[PDB]
Design a protein around this ligand. Structure first.
Ligand SMILES: O=C(NC1(c2ccc(Cl)cc2)COC1)c1ccc(N2CC[C@H](O)C2)cc1
Length: 334
């Protein structure tokens, strides 16, 4: 067995379906956001303890931790704004209007060196062909520097990830296209059709010879980063990995969530991958003629919609978040 399960705990302060759940850079704090606009900052080591909590008056759609200033958290709204929140001072340092016509801040990514961040800003959802923009910001001044043109047309970018040094940014969009941006030259280095439907999550492999993606068509694909649109491997995931995630009752009433947060997460070496399931997290060994689960974390009574995996002090922690608002924290030893 690759992992020893040390334990499983539950964080139950959210009373609404989870949108996002991310561990900070220190590997000690979580910022979780639910669909009611409640943002919680909490610790889990040595015990579960809420550090900060707030109800947003306006809609909140994305969150991203700072990479050098651990306590700083970026919050993207649904009213065209980016909030910088100091989790130690329990106060907003600023709120900047990220222009107009595109109020949905769907994605936020902080560059590894701490000098910049990117955000995706999209128009209201009317069709799948809805316009969007990709903005580059300076963290020192909290000012927008530029906007990257998207070809063939403006489109909603759903997910963003930087590579280790921060000179490349991989993005996934609502048109199913993956765009790789050179961050030194500020241009699209590569782009290809990745999915038949929306791209939900993107990540660079640990060796950075590939990029992983998960999309609306239910596929988990590994792409060759040196040869545009060339596949390294491809897998059809179970439907409860990509949703729509549905929570029903006996009332006729049901809640339906399409992926918004991280749909996959990786161990420190990028050899294992954590995914969603109706019952809890499912981990697959990567590089294995189909893909088979090696660890099922369980513990959920409502569909898991977003996951995270962090490693700190040679101890891995898996976050699995569900539609009833429950967040399970599974401790994994190598
Ligand atoms: O906190 C500010 N920057 C730093 C930073 C680091 C990481 C991230 Cl992700 C974002 C920002 C650069 O080191 C801290 C910071 C705070 C307030 C500022 N205002 C307030 C009034 C104006 O809007 C400028 C500017 C800048």
């Amino acid at each position: 067995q690759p992992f020893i399960v040390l334990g499983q705990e539950e964080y139950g302060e959210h009373h609404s379906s989870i949108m996002h759940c991310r561990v900070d850079c220190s590997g000690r704090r979580v910022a979780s956001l639910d669909v009611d606009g409640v943002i919680k900052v909490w610790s889990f080591n040595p015990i579960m303890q809420t550090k900060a909590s707030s109800i947003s008056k306006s809609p909140l759609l994305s969150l991203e931790w700072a990479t050098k200033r651990d306590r700083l958290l970026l919050l993207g709204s649904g009213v065209g704004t980016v909030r910088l929140y100091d989790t130690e001072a329990k106060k907003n340092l600023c709120e900047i209007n990220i222009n107009d016509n595109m109020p949905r801040i769907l994605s936020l990514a902080c560059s590894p060196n701490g000098a910049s961040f990117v955000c995706s800003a999209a128009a209201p959802s009317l069709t799948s062909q809805v316009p969007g923009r990709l903005l580059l910001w300076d963290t020192k001044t909290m000012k927008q520097q530029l906007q990257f043109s998207l070809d063939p047309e403006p489109i909603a970018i759903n997910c963003t990830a930087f590579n280790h040094n921060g000179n490349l940014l991989v993005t996934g969009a609502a048109d199913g296209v993956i765009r790789l941006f050179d961050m030194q030259q500020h241009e699209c280095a590569m782009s290809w059709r990745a999915h038949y439907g929306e791209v939900y999550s993107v990540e660079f492999s640990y060796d950075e010879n590939t990029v992983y993606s998960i999309g609306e068509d239910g596929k988990f694909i590994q792409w060759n980063i040196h040869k545009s649109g060339l596949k390294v491997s491809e897998y059809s995931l179970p439907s409860d990995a990509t949703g729509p995630f549905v929570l029903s009752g006996y009332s006729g009433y049901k809640q339906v969530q399409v992926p918004r947060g991280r749909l996959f997460a990786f161990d420190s070496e990028g050899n294992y991958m954590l995914t969603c399931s109706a019952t809890g997290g499912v981990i697959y060994k990567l590089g294995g003629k189909v893909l088979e689960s090696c660890l099922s974390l369980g513990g959920h009574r409502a569909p898991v919609v977003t996951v995270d995996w962090s490693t700190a002090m040679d101890c891995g922690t898996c976050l699995t978040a569900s539609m009833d608002g429950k967040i399970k924290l599974t401790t994994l030893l190598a």
